[PDB]
Paper text:
The engagement of a DNA glycosylase with a damaged DNA base marks the initiation of base excision repair. Here, we report cryo-electron microscopy structures of nucleosomes bearing a deoxyinosine (DI) in various geometric positions and structures of them in complex with the DNA glycosylase AAG. The apo nucleosome structures show that the presence of a DI alone perturbs nucleosomal DNA globally, leading to a general weakening of the interface between DNA and the histone core and greater flexibility for the exit/entry of the nucleosomal DNA. Mechanistically, local distortion augmentation, translation/rotational register shift and partial opening of the nucleosome are employed by AAG to cope with substrate sites in fully exposed, occluded and completely buried positions, respectively.
We subsequently determined the structures of the NCP–53I and AAG–NCP–53AP at resolutions of 2.8 Å and 3.1 Å, respectively. Similar to the AAG–NCP–50AP complex, AAG in AAG–NCP–53AP is flexible, but the nucleosomal DNA including the AP site and the inserted residue Tyr162 are nicely resolved. AAG in AAG–NCP–53AP is angled at ~85° against the plane parallel to the nucleosome disc. Importantly, in the AAG–NCP–53AP, a drastic local DNA distortion was observed, and the maximal distortion is at –53 with an RMSD of 7.4 Å. There is a significant widening of the minor groove in the local region of –53 position compared to the apo NCP–53I, which is also reflected by much larger displacements for both the damaged and undamaged strands: the calculated RMSDs of the DNA backbones from –58 to –48 (–53 ± 5 positions) are 8.1 Å and 3.9 Å for the damaged and undamaged strands, respectively. Intriguingly, in comparison to the local DNA distortions in the AAG–NCP–30AP and AAG–NCP–50AP, an additional translocation of local DNA around –53 was observed. The AP site at –53 in the AAG–NCP–53AP is relocated to –52 in spatial relation to the translational register of NCP–53I. Since base-flipping at –53 on a regular NCP would cause a clash with H2B, this local register shift from –53 to –52 appears to be necessary for AAG to interact with the flipped base. It must be noted that the global translational register is not affected, and this translocation is restricted to the region from the damage site to the near exit end of the nucleosomal DNA. For the DI in occluded positions such as –53 with medium accessibility, where AAG activity is expected to be lower comparing to solvent-facing positions, AAG induces drastic local DNA distortion, including both twisting and translocation of DNA to generate a shift of local DNA register by 1 bp to relieve the nucleosome-imposed spatial hindrance for accessing the damaged site.
Numbering used by the authors:
A (entry chain K): 82 to 199, 208 to 248, 255 to 295
B (entry chain A): 38 to 134
C (entry chain E): 41 to 134
D (entry chain G): 12 to 118
E (entry chain C): 14 to 117
F (entry chain B): 22 to 102
G (entry chain F): 23 to 102
H (entry chain H): 30 to 121
The structure:
Amino acid sequence: HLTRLGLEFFDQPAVPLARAFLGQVLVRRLPNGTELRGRIVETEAYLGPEDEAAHSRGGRQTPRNRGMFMKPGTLYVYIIYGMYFCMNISSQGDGACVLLRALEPLEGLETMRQLRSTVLKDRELCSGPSKLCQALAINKSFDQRDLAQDEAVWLERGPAVVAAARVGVGHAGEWARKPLRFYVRGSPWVSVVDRVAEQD
Amino acid sequence: PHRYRPGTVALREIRRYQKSTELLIRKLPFQRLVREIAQDFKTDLRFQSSAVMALQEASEAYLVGLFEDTNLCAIHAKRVTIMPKDIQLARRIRGER
Amino acid sequence: YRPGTVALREIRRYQKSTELLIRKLPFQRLVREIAQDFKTDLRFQSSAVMALQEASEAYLVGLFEDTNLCAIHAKRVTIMPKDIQLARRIRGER
Amino acid sequence: AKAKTRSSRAGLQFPVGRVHRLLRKGNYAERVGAGAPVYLAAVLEYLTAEILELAGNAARDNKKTRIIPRHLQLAVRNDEELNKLLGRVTIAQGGVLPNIQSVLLPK
Amino acid sequence: AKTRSSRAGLQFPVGRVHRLLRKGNYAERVGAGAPVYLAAVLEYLTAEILELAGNAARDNKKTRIIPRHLQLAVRNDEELNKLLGRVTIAQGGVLPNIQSVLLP
Amino acid sequence: LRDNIQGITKPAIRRLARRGGVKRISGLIYEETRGVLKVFLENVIRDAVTYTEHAKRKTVTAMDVVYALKRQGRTLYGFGG
Amino acid sequence: RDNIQGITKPAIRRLARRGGVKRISGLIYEETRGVLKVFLENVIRDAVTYTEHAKRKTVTAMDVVYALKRQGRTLYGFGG
Amino acid sequence: RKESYAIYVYKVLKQVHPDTGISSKAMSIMNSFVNDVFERIAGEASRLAHYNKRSTITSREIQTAVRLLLPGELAKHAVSEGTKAVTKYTSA
Amino acid sequence: KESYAIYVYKVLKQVHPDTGISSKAMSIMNSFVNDVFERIAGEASRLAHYNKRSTITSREIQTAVRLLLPGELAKHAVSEGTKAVTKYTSA
DNA sequence: ATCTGACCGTGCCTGGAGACTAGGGAGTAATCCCCTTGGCGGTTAAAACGCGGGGGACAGCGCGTACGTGCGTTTAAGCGGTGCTAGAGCTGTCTACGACCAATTGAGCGGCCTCGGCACCGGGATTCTCCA
DNA sequence: TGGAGAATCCCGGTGCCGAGGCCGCTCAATTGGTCGTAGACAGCTCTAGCACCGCTTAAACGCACGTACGCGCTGTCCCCCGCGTTTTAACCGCCAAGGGGATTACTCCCTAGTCTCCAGGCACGCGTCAGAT
């Protein structure tokens, strides 16, 4: 194949890569022989120690979060205080990473519909990161591996951008209310919307 | 003349006052005290006469109970006279500070 | 050591502590023995016995504070039953 | 269809109806039952009789015919159950009981 | 659909306070400013308790408050010791206070 | 209105003490007792004035003092109820 | 059946050392066992009354909290 | 119109002491005693009804309130008098 | 069941952001809020019955706060409640 | 150096909020009458002051003993684990009990008049206290 | 031991003012009837309480010894009690008056009640991160 991004594009900082991270098609080749061809609609960014909600705030050197400063663009699937997973790729620097939030597929709905049921409307079937992590067959065995090896998950280039404030973080701190998360305008399949931010 | 030994008049005063029910503080200094304390909270107040009598009965009963507890505090220290230490200790055990 | 030196160390240790100084299972047996005289065949939640233990400990510590001030009032450093009776009478229980 | 008072039905002197009206317009519950005013009237009648019998005995001990507040103070404070029911109250014009500790009496 | 907690600038639920005032049989009718006032008073009191408790935990070099810090906060301040006088705190201990005649 | 606490005389405190069963009185009792009385009344009528401030009245009634005493666990009988 | 003796002498000493007491006489222990028995009898009797009205046979912690609130000895930390 | 427990306390006084009267201040004291005991028992019955999630005050609530407030022998005699009155009211 | 846990946590995070609360201390704060609620509501109920008024408005709550709290704490609580009621009425 | 009790995604659910109607409780103003502040003055009771002297507070000394401290045995709590089942806790159903309303009627409350219990006065018998 | 002197008690007579009965009338308690829902009653679930079993181990326990401490006795002197005398002002009586509580009439706006719905809030998951030891 040819539509796979390399290390010349993944070696970028947080904000300019996250601004160019709209509509990208994250495809995991699950071994049944099918593909999802799902397009992203919203992402989240962590610049570093400036944001208090980041997991690497103030130069954290935890033994779990150690593969991000070795090389930029590192694959990172990780739990959220339990069994729900989230999808992340890091960047050059300290505490800088981008997280994938919501996807919209075009095919293979029945497979993820059966795999989700471990009442089944497709609007709330993939409206969140833990929903797509239970739809893209995402496990804990995707931590020590790059984005350009063998036949695993990669990126594909598919065919207005509004910055919205964080929802669900509470009214605390001085960096939890800055609008930095980018999401599409006018799409009726977005989980987190901002009606007051549509007028800029 | 006849000269009573110290203590006997005190005991007969204890009999006389514990036998009677009449209020011991003069009413007009207590009325002026109530009005002087009430001047610090709301200026130009007025008092019903029954209110000042109620305050006098409450204050006299409180002082008599405190003097009972003060007396047992003084007897606890193997004394007969009462000191400010006894009033302070009685108020600290009762919780009033 | 001299007498009164280890005692002040125990006071400084136990006032900085938090935990229950009365033993849990004999206190539970005493609670059962008291409640037997009121209703036969009773049952107790564990939180009920812990609540009774915390209330009894706080009550006895406050009583011993007042007992100590009664004993210091009588030019003494040893507390006696008359001090407990005096503090309990001035409180109003006796 | 002769009207019988609820106190006359319960064999009581305290009013069942007034106690019912006060329980309604005192904001104690949204509903007040039928037996609750009868029970509370009987309890209040018993407590009134218990104070008044001892106050009458105290007034008879002082060779007087009518009960003054001093007799009520003696009646309350000379019964242990009535004293611990009424331990934080001041009977006005009531005085105190005659007691002196034994270390103040002469030898 | 603005809630009354955000309408008054309060962190406590005005609606839940209003419901507990209605269902508590306190009076037949309740006002509109009464739950707002009561929620503001409760928020101020818990802010003062939490501020003094966090100060007591910071002086003990602990970053999470326990009931001992609450006891130190209440009984080191005179007004809260006056308000919470007849109230005991589970696992609260007592203040470090040693009488003067016992020390040599 | 100034220095009316001295109107509660030394024989008045002596009468209240011999009502309470006290046989002998030190000289420093009286001033101390006066202070105690002030701490009582500044705690009682401050409530009662507050009650008078809620009914929009200018007169402190007896029943207000009864309520102020019942708030402090010092219930008074004989002046309304 | 004498479980009041289970409140040991060093337990009374520990409760007094938290209370600031330095010396303890040998007749303190029986008196404070009687004190604990009276206080516990009062609170347990009111809690058993609450359990009788609730038509239960298990004394809950809420009944003990209500009993201590009745005496004026409010306990925080048990759902009160 | 001021309501008071005057004639009822007169009737109980003449029932227990037929040759004994009473003064006006003792009416004030006994009226305040009846009002305070009423407020105490009714408030405890309100708390009992609020605790077990009930909306009605019955004779069971007043019975448990009388058991909670009054000391032992006085409480037992009060409960006996109240249940006698309630049984007589229901049966007649 | 219903508790004041999340609101007490929000008050904590406003006053001390780098501070946490254990479970038992949160239970103590829930008991404290319920106890102060019962005290102020009971005093407001008594002041409704004394003045023969059937409504508990902000005036009874203000004077219940003034009766039930010691001096500086009562003054600041009255000020905070008046500020909240005025801001709520203006909005 | 080592143990350990709280941290943003998700289904759902249910109580709070906007909107509309009604009615009654509180606000406002004029009027009325108890009642509370203020003043004058005489009388006499109570407080204030001085002084003597008894007696209790207080400091010091000595002694007996009784608690503190420490050490070795001992014992039964504490923690963990297993089995069993009583009873808290919830749900459905039906019916009995209380809220509410209207008519009726008697009882309790204010007004009012009358006589007797009780405070007071005064001389005489009795008792307490101090004393040589 | 008697005895002087003061204090408390006790008898009978005066007079007053407040308790106690009578009575008219308002208004609140009672009698029937409806109707609605709270609550008693039966039944099922499954949480949590209870009884019991070994182990190890920290705490309770008994004993020995000694020194601090309670407690009794004693001397001193200071402060408070008793009492007489003089100054002070409570108190009783009476009156003026004016401010303020109570009451009534009449609205009128705020809160109860109800329908609909939607967004907070309680229940859930366990690695591990700081947090505590």
